[PDB]
Subunit: 40 residues, 3 copies
């Protein structure tokens, strides 16, 4: 089911975003790769 | 042009995250593939 | 180490998503590609 994302973070080291999901026992997440960089 | 995201959902049936956009009639979304799992 | 995403914005021409990060000087971002479309 499409459930809400309640919190989103991005890890500096691994270039993974992690979305915490509003469902069930609270331990579901979704993860995807990203490119992280400093802007000008 | 930059388009604001109002909220995000993720679906464990489809393995897609969906971001809802503040744009036009309100019915646009941006989607991407994600992992979805239950953590420790 | 995870850092908070403060907001997400999607580019309306390229469909790239930018996540703004709460870290350091405020200028760090994470980016990934998306599929944008219009729903019912």
């Amino acid at each position: 089911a499409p459930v809400p994302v309640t919190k989103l973070v991005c890890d500096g080291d691994t270039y993974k975003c992690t979305a915490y999901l509003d469902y069930g026992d609270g331990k579901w997440v979704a993860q995807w790769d990203t490119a992280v960089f400093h802007t000008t």
